[PDB]
Design a protein around this nucleic acid. Structure first.
Lengths: 147, 202, 62, 211, 95, 205
RNA sequence: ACGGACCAAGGAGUCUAGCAAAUGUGCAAGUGUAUAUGAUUCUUUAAACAUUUUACGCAUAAUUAAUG
RNA sequence: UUUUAAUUUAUUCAUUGGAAUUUUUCAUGUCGAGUCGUGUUCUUUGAGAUUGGAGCACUAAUACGUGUGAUACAUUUCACA
RNA sequence: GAUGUUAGGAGGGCAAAUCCGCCGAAUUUAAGCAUAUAAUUAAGCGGAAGAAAAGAAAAUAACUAUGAUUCCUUUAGUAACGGCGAGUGAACAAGGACCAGCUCAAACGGUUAAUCCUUCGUUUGGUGCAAACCUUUCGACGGAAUUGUCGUU
């Protein structure tokens, strides 16, 4: 795919589509991001304000492996389990699902969403949020710690 | 445990008797030539705790080496950027101990191979080491089930830094995050690191 | 599906026409008798709507 | 740079033609490896090349819930299985000295796996019909007929492969058995808040036990 | 987070002894060689200074001896060990 | 690709101020005809072209698996209609129904004379004639690069278990074979066309 | 004002990495099958096919120096 | 034609030797020195009150230690070699 | 220690694509330029193999823990360094390939160096025409070795 290029349309045009008066020169402004704080500063200050300066204390070797924690909002909990089991659980007023989110691969449970009124659910996750716990217990459900 | 006693007494280096013995030995070393043969070990303790043996194909050479750095090489007043102006305070990378067996394994005895060296003594200027060398051609070492590996071609270990001093000064003597980079050797690891690999199907 | 059902909640007898595809939302619990017409679907959404009891109208049928 | 683009971040500023190397030979190298391993197992009289490995739980917080294949058992499991390491390394069992069993559950699972493997061996005679009782806890040397009838059957590799895990994320409990007094947020925050002082308590426990 | 040797780990995922709930399980030659080499060698030139500084037997003497030992030998652990050992041996020789 | 040091193995000297000649580099020396000539560059004789095509182009193309499976399904279903099979170019007017299938005994055939007699008795004599006569030396410089002949395509036979077909239907110029579970679009839809006259077996179908 | 005595051939916005935008396509809260694994594929075949019930990237939720 | 397995098939009589596991005791044994390390200097590194190395000065502790646990310190644990 | 046209053997140079150490720049970029960047690169010197080098923890984590080395995807253009500018740039874990582990030293053996070797011999059988080689163990002399070989862990 070379004849589709823009250049293949301007063979007989002298300027090759890169101007005549200005001419096409190698590295006009300066190589790389060289214009910082001297002459290209308007572009930085208009599109990337906070680029310059350093803020904050130092984490030496973060080792991101420790604070890894995928998040799940509280409404998606029902959607996790299959819809036929959803139907049977909704049908019966005596059985409630138990969702050990560690099996799926989730750690924290967050409070965003809107559950189904008058239905208890058992949840097992490494972490919880206060609003999520309030939502869970407001409908007869229980939050169970796990590790 | 006689060797243990010898290790314990040599561990001091600042008893009166040890200081006297060191002075006299170093003085009678200095008047001898720079590199030569010593028919028997001067520190059998350290030698035999190393890979020394009492079999036919073993040689011990005593060598000297000048203390101090090497200074730069340029003629008189150098040419370059300011970051490389200074010459006097520049330091080398190969340790004096390594240079010791370098001076002996380089040319003067090419029939032999280097194993390691030990302390011997010291002085104001001329440091002292006794390099151990092993004959790879006498039938004893060939027939020996042990050590004979040194008779399987890998020559001039001192020039490739394969001795104890080589491992010490190449960063190989410490594992883990303390060294990290130099494990597959410095240049090989840098090549692997900054090398870029592509694929046929992107 | 959640938005689609919400927007048909006002009048139940009409058929929705949406030019793009309709995606299934696991954030919804139950669905009720929805009649739709779109270009593409998703197997999960198709199964969900068939179980609900509606039917997927394609533009030719429309 | 030209207006609203990401800031360039190209790490090509040094020589790289010197170090570019693409891999055209992926598929043919794969074929060569296949042929080499096939020849290696064919020359080995039908004995499977693969070796049994333990099952261990992965380190760190992120992977604190999966099993995988390590490198060798420790001496305790082998002793429970009645195998000395220097006679167990010769029949396709991996041994080391670094791991030290720390959980009785893993100990039991590893010894169960090892005993199953040992029961599943069918020994080959060593010196042409000089069958004996074996040493070091190796299984007894089977005779002519059993090896003759088994050598033409497919050798199982499921034990060689890693184990699947059961993840019953769908389970049910009775609503009546629910304790609705458990404030999980309170539990978590109290545990985090009482972190330091109980460390003082444990340190003083240790310093008192030191005597 | 320090572990707890007994009282198996609680079900909580963070805090003291956190984790899962799995089960947990559980000279004659030297002094002779030391004294013979001591007789054959003796004390070092700075060992004599340390001996006399600790023999002066004042708190200022002890502080100065520790400072001298640390500046002479490097690090604090080894200096403290040298001070305690040398004061032990000087007490034994005084006895 | 071309050699890395293409033409750049010469001297880089450009004395071009005062001599009243072009500013392109020249080469030192004398006596030789090369002395004084235009030196390396995209400009003159032997100076090497301007952008040496390197060995690390983007040759291949990663193609989505669902995309490829969809394409295979569409291709195989294309041949399930006579109009497009005719529009492609296969001579099939004497066949009855284009999903043409044969009993598994076709898998057991073991002689090319009987194979061609089969494929003619089915009415594909015209197809055989066209395939036989299409063999012709192609034009251009390709015939000089071990790519002399350019033969057309014929019916594709699909079989489930080889019992002689793999070494029976070749040597029929323009016919190629593909097992069911390893069917490749490169054989199913050559040239990016639509549909392909395909003869199945019962087990395969 | 500067280059052009004449003729024939060669002669210049290309390639790669990364990002963004526009367009077309598949799939869709998932997506991509990476290294690699199996196969009576093993002229063409250095390609196609295939991938036992959480590998990862990118996305699903943001924010503060930071314990969170 | 080179190798490499299954496939044949081994039987007598004897000595010498050693190994593994398993009961009972002795005894808690050894374990790499101008080396580690510290200070200083130079270079190198993503390493940041110094990552590695090296010159120079001082110079060690014996497994109840000494080296790590990416911020310099003293007190004291624990984890791993 | 010296001495040897002593007997028996080795080293020297050529060749470098990959590899192994030392020394060691500048052009350039930063739109100037001195820290930096080019680069632990180019040049030079010295050394081997068919692969080498690395390799059996004075490791990593901090968890229900893994478990020699090397290499491929990923961690990641991230933690971090930096006239905090241009720029530079990791390691752990995860998934794969392959997967082999060991002995010097220290201890113990003195009613016994239980060793090793040169040379000269003795023979156990065999492929090969010849030629040559592979397997084969009882010594004699002379040694080296207690300033420590071999046995055992």
């Amino acid at each position: 795919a070379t004849r589709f290029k823009k250049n293949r349309k301007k063979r007989g045009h002298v300027s090759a589509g890169h101007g005549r008066v200005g001419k096409h020169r190698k590295h006009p402004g300066g190589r790389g991001k060289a214009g910082g704080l001297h002459h290209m500063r308007i572009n930085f200050d208009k599109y990337h304000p906070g680029y310059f300066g350093k803020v904050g204390m130092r984490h030496l070797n973060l080792l991101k492996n420790r604070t890894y924690c995928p998040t799940i909002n509280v409404d998606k909990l029902w959607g996790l389990l299959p819809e036929e089991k959803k139907k049977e659980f909704s049908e019966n007023k005596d059985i409630a699902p138990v969702i050990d989110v560690t099996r799926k691969g989730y750690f924290k449970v967050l409070g965003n969403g809107k559950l189904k009124h008058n239905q208890p659910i058992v949840v097992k996750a490494r972490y919880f949020s206060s609003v999520a716990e309030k939502k869970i217990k407001a409908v007869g459900g229980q939050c169970i710690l796990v590790a | 445990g006689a060797y243990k006693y010898i290790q314990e007494i040599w561990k001091k280096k600042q008893s009166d008797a040890m200081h006297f013995l060191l002075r006299v030995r170093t003085w009678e070393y200095r008047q001898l030539p720079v590199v030569h043969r010593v028919s028997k070990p001067s520190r059998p303790d350290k030698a035999r705790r190393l890979g020394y043996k009492a079999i036919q194909g073993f040689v011990i050479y005593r060598v000297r080496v000048r203390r101090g750095d090497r200074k730069k090489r340029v003629k008189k007043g150098v040419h370059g950027k300011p970051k490389h102006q200074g010459v006097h305070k520049q330091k080398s990378t190969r340790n004096l101990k390594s240079v010791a067996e370098g001076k002996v394994g380089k040319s003067i005895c090419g029939n032999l191979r280097v194993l390691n060296s030990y302390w011997v003594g010291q002085d104001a200027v001329y440091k002292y080491y006794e390099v151990i060398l092993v004959d790879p051609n006498h039938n004893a070492v060939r027939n020996n089930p042990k050590i004979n590996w040194i008779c399987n071609p890998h020559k001039h270990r001192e020039l490739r830094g394969l001795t104890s001093a080589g491992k010490k000064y190449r960063g190989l003597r410490v594992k883990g995050h303390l060294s990290a980079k130099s494990r597959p050797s410095i240049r090989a690891n840098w090549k692997r690191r900054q090398l870029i690999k592509l694929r046929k199907c992107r | 599906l959640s938005k689609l059902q919400y927007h048909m909640a006002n009048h139940p007898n009409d058929i929705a026409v949406v030019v793009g595809s309709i995606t299934d939302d696991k954030r919804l619990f139950s669905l009720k008798q929805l009649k739709v017409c779109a270009l593409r679907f998703t197997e999960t959404a198709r199964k969900r709507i068939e179980d609900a009891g509606g039917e997927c109208l394609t533009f030719d049928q429309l | 740079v030209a207006h609203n683009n990401v800031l360039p971040n190209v790490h090509l500023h040094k020589w790289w033609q010197r170090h570019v190397r693409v891999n055209f030979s992926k598929n043919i190298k794969k074929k060569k490896r296949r042929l080499l391993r096939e020849k290696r197992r064919k020359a080995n009289g039908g004995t499977p090349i693969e070796k049994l490995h333990p099952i261990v739980h992965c380190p760190t917080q992120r992977y604190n819930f999966r099993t995988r294949l390590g490198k060798g058992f420790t001496f305790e499991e082998l002793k429970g299985a009645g195998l000395t390491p220097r006679a167990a390394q010769t029949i396709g069992i991996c041994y080391d000295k670094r791991r030290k069993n720390r959980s009785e559950e893993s100990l039991t699972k590893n010894v169960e796996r090892l005993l199953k493997y040992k029961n599943s061996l069918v020994m080959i005679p060593l010196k042409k019909n000089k069958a004996k009782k074996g040493i070091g806890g190796i299984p007894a040397d089977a005779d002519k007929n059993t090896i003759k009838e088994f050598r033409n059957k497919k050798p199982l590799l499921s034990i060689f492969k890693k184990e699947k895990n059961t993840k019953p994320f769908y389970e049910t409990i009775e609503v009546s058995k629910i304790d609705k007094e458990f404030l999980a947020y309170k539990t978590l925050r109290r545990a985090k808040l009482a972190e330091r002082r109980k460390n003082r308590r444990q340190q003083k426990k240790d310093i008192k036990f030191k005597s | 987070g320090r572990k707890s040797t007994i009282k198996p780990a609680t079900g909580i995922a963070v805090g003291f002894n956190s984790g899962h709930v799995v089960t947990k399980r559980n000279s004659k030659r030297k002094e002779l060689i030391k004294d013979v080499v001591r007789e054959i060698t003796g004390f070092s030139p700075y060992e004599k200074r340390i001996i006399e500084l600790i023999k002066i037997g004042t708190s200022a003497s002890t502080k100065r001896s520790l400072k001298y030992a640390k500046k002479k030998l490097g690090t604090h652990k080894r200096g403290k060990a040298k001070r305690e050992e040398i004061q032990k041996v000087v007490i034994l020789q005084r006895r | 690709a071309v050699k890395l040091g293409a033409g750049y193995e010469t001297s880089a000297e450009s004395w071009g101020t005062g001599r009243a000649v072009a500013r392109i580099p020249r080469v030192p020396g004398g006596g030789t005809h090369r002395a004084g000539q235009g030196a390396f560059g995209n400009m003159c004789r032997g100076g090497g072209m301007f952008n040496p095509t390197k060995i690390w182009r983007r040759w291949g193309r990663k193609v989505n698996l669902k995309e490829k499976r969809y394409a295979v399904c569409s291709s195989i279903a294309a041949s399930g209609v006579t109009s497009l099979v005719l529009a492609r170019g296969h001579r099939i007017s004497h066949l009855k129904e284009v999903p043409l299938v044969v009993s598994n005994d076709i898998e057991s055939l073991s002689k090319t004379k009987e194979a061609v007699n089969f494929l003619v008795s089915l009415g594909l004599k015209d197809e055989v004639n066209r395939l036989v006569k299409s063999k012709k030396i192609r034009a251009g410089k390709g015939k000089m690069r071990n790519r002399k002949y350019k033969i057309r395509n014929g019916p594709l036979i699909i079989y489930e278990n080889d019992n002689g077909v793999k070494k029976a239907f070749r040597n029929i110029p323009g016919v190629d074979l593909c097992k069911v579970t390893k069917l490749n679009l490169l054989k199913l839809a050559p040239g990016g066309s639509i549909g392909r006259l395909c003869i199945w077996s019962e087990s395969a179908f």
